[PDB]
Amino acid sequence: MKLGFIGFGEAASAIASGLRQAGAIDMAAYDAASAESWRPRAEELGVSCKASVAEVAGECDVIFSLVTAQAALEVAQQAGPHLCEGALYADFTSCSPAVKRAIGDVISRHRPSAQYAAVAVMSAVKPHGHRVPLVVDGDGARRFQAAFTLYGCRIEVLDGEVGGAALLKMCRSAVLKGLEALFLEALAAAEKMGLADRVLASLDASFPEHHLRDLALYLVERNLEHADRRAHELGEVAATLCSVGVEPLVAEAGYRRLTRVAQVRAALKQRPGDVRAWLRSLANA
Amino acid sequence: MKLGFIGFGEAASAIASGLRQAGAIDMAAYDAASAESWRPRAEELGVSCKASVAEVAGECDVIFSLVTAQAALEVAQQAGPHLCEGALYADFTSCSPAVKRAIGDVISRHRPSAQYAAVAVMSAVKPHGHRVPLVVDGDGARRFQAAFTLYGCRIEVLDGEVGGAALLKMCRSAVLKGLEALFLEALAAAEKMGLADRVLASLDASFPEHHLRDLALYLVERNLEHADRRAHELGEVAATLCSVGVEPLVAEAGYRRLTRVAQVRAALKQRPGDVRAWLRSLANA
Ligand SMILES: [Cl-]
Ligand SMILES: [Cl-]
Ligand SMILES: [Cl-]
Ligand SMILES: [Cl-]
């Protein structure tokens, strides 16, 4: 198999590094960013660097599109006419369900023998590499599952309309990032009078089975670390909600909240040592 | 003891009914609403009906103010000059911390020997009656606790500035009602493609210790019942957050979400039988 990556950022290269160690695979890549940003990491993993999307698409039988959500459609339009017969095109982007369907239609118009896997990456790549849980739909989902399970990939196939995996991912992130925004808002408010611990004790006493204090402390700990990517992700979730006909009232407000929280984090000369001090810096901001 | 109620709605009368069965107490009441709305329920519990706030305040040594948050301050201003020497004035309203402090100041200016209990009612009254968990601050908190623990009341005294109990209540409701709004939004979106169950299974597999599926199903069940009061409460929480210097981004959006959810509920000729059908009616709305 000749595997080609369109986009070779941190996530994409962690996947490529994982697949290299998992078995024998011929890998090629192209990233629209400056050569210095992606070419050293790619050559280090033994990945053949390319000059265009057209080049990757013409040389590889399997394509992984790992670009930004905004570039997902244009990259498929560029790739479509260069894809070989019976190619597998796998879109891993965080684009909306309607855009996953539009992408499948671009691949179908340009290379009718090709198959399409609309892949939803279920959580951050970093802790798992190539083994990050994936949920996939599209006429190439089963094929993508059978091919990449061989390398230890974790792939579930969703048996519905294309874009379903994309919506499941975005609704899961709306809950997780929305919970993070909710705790940061209500707990920064409680800390205006040093009550965050008492609010959390109150939640735990009323819903003991759910361990809300532990959940809030974990979500705030992660915030005190990866503050930036979670704000961005909630902005993409709000756009997906809007695309399926749900006005993203809560999701957009969460996105505004996490954005404001990251500006407070960024403004500090020195980040707070712990979750308690972080909730206090937010109260004092 | 001669106990007087200002406001005799469902919550206030459930408390009065509880105290009657808990022991011997002389109770009086006044409610600004039409006589037909409160007088039958009061006479039934053996509560002496009054013609004014001034009348209750002049005849009783303990006052419970259970009016709306918007009326809390004006009722204290009316009561203050009629309070007997060493009276205990207990404000149970869902007003902001700054308003609980202003009320304590009104009681102090008019009757300096009087004591003040700024009472936060920690959850809905209905399941508990007089035994609803209360958290209280103010110079009369200990006195309120010692007096009403005798009747089986559940009272915790908060050892800080007046208004602290009010803020703890509002921040706990911001989380609980905010979680309800978040699930209703993200799960109505998931149901646009019948994925709410899969989103919940995904949350449960990633955070098993927290039982999020069970928590979401409970919060949505309660919504399918008491939809109206929870929307209102989140509107009051957003106002308290704003009063302590936190822009209520998430809380206000939650309030808008629960409001929209109640309009969908209200518009149905016949309410859905279950949580699943309710999430589907919201997707289809
Ligand atoms: Cl990632
Ligand atoms: Cl909506
Ligand atoms: Cl209530
Ligand atoms: Cl703020």
Side-chain angles (χ1 to χ4, degrees), chain A residues 1-228 230-264 266-270 272-285, chain B residues 1-228 230-264 266-270 272-285:
Chain A
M1 187 208 283
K2 305 187 197 295
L3 175 59
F5 294 76
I6 307 162
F8 215 70
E10 285 278 346
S13 68
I15 293 156
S17 180
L19 293 178
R20 185 197 192 190
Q21 295 204 340
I25 191 148
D26 198 307
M27 299 180 280
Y30 172 79
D31 188 305
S34 56
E36 288 91 340
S37 171
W38 65 275
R39 293 180 190 253
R41 173 69 170 159
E43 285 160 346
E44 171 218 321
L45 303 172
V47 189
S48 341
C49 289
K50 299 293 155 185
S52 68
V53 169
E55 210 183 345
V56 177
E59 285 175 56
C60 307
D61 32 45
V62 182
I63 304 298
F64 288 179
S65 180
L66 285 132
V67 297
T68 65
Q70 290 295 94
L73 185 51
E74 167 195 23
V75 160
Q77 291 173 343
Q78 291 189 281
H82 301 89
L83 291 182
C84 66
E85 295 291 329
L88 171 63
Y89 189 93
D91 186 284
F92 282 65
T93 77
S94 51
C95 70
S96 66
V99 174
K100 289 287 178 170
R101 288 193 286 277
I103 293 161
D105 284 358
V106 160
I107 303 305
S108 176
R109 177 180 176 234
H110 290 287
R111 191 64 45 228
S113 67
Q115 284 163 297
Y116 178 55
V119 177
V121 180
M122 299 299 294
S123 54
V125 171
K126 184 204 90 272
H128 308 106
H130 77 293
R131 307 204 76 203
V132 57
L134 300 184
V135 179
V136 189
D137 43 45
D139 71 356
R142 281 221 263 268
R143 178 177 165 193
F144 175 73
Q145 184 181 55
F148 293 91
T149 294
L150 300 184
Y151 299 93
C153 295
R154 291 188 171 105
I155 299 157
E156 173 184 339
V157 162
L158 207 54
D159 231 88
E161 154 177 58
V162 171
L167 184 59
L168 168 60
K169 177 185 156 78
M170 302 302 239
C171 290
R172 175 188 149 91
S173 309
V175 172
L176 298 176
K177 288 71 174 162
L179 272 159
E180 176 185 354
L182 177 57
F183 286 129
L184 290 160
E185 188 171 286
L187 303 177
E191 264 322 79
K192 295 277 186 189
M193 291 173 96
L195 291 162
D197 281 344
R198 187 68 196 77
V199 167
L200 292 181
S202 185
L203 296 163
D204 252 13
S206 286
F207 291 90
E209 332 104 285
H210 307 287
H211 306 98
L212 301 173
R213 173 186 190 265
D214 289 345
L215 181 63
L217 294 174
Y218 171 80
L219 297 170
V220 174
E221 183 88 50
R222 257 186 68 90
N223 183 273
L224 182 54
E225 183 173 56
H226 309 285
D228 309 337
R230 258 86 49 74
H232 176 95
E233 280 152 29
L234 199 46
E236 284 184 345
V237 162
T240 278
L241 288 200
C242 193
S243 81
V244 302
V246 170
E247 185 179 357
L249 304 169
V250 175
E252 184 194 333
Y255 170 63
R256 297 181 62 206
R257 174 53 61 207
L258 297 178
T259 299
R260 196 165 290 177
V261 163
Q263 302 162 347
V264 177
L268 299 163
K269 309 288 166 297
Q270 196 64 193
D274 51 72
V275 168
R276 332 279 164 176
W278 181 217
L279 290 178
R280 209 153 278 183
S281 310
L282 292 160
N284 283 314
Chain B
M1 187 208 283
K2 305 187 197 295
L3 175 59
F5 294 76
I6 307 162
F8 215 70
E10 285 278 346
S13 68
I15 293 156
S17 180
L19 293 178
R20 185 197 192 190
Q21 295 204 340
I25 191 148
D26 198 307
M27 299 180 280
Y30 172 79
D31 188 305
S34 56
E36 288 91 340
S37 171
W38 65 275
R39 293 180 190 253
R41 173 69 170 159
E43 285 160 346
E44 171 218 321
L45 303 172
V47 189
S48 341
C49 289
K50 299 293 155 185
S52 68
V53 169
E55 210 183 345
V56 177
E59 285 175 56
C60 307
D61 32 45
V62 182
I63 304 298
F64 288 179
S65 180
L66 285 132
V67 297
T68 65
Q70 290 295 94
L73 185 51
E74 167 195 23
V75 160
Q77 291 173 343
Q78 291 189 281
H82 301 89
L83 291 182
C84 66
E85 295 291 329
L88 171 63
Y89 189 93
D91 186 284
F92 282 65
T93 77
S94 51
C95 70
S96 66
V99 174
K100 289 287 178 170
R101 288 193 286 277
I103 293 161
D105 284 358
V106 160
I107 303 305
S108 176
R109 177 180 176 234
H110 290 287
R111 191 64 45 228
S113 67
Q115 284 163 297
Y116 178 55
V119 177
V121 180
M122 299 299 294
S123 54
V125 171
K126 184 204 90 272
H128 308 106
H130 77 293
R131 307 204 76 203
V132 57
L134 300 184
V135 179
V136 189
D137 43 45
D139 71 356
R142 281 221 263 268
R143 178 177 165 193
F144 175 73
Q145 184 181 55
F148 293 91
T149 294
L150 300 184
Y151 299 93
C153 295
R154 291 188 171 105
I155 299 157
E156 173 184 339
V157 162
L158 207 54
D159 231 88
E161 154 177 58
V162 171
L167 184 59
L168 168 60
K169 177 185 156 78
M170 302 302 239
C171 290
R172 175 188 149 91
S173 309
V175 172
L176 298 176
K177 288 71 174 162
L179 272 159
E180 176 185 354
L182 177 57
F183 286 129
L184 290 160
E185 188 171 286
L187 303 177
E191 264 322 79
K192 295 277 186 189
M193 291 173 96
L195 291 162
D197 281 344
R198 187 68 196 77
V199 167
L200 292 181
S202 185
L203 296 163
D204 252 13
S206 286
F207 291 90
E209 332 104 285
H210 307 287
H211 306 98
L212 301 173
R213 173 186 190 265
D214 289 345
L215 181 63
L217 294 174
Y218 171 80
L219 297 170
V220 174
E221 183 88 50
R222 257 186 68 90
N223 183 273
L224 182 54
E225 183 173 56
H226 309 285
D228 309 337
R230 258 86 49 74
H232 176 95
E233 280 152 29
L234 199 46
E236 284 184 345
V237 162
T240 278
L241 288 200
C242 193
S243 81
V244 302
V246 170
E247 185 179 357
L249 304 169
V250 175
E252 184 194 333
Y255 170 63
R256 297 181 62 206
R257 174 53 61 207
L258 297 178
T259 299
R260 196 165 290 177
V261 163
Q263 302 162 347
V264 177
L268 299 163
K269 309 288 166 297
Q270 196 64 193
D274 51 72
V275 168
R276 332 279 164 176
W278 181 217
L279 290 178
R280 209 153 278 183
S281 310
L282 292 160
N284 283 314

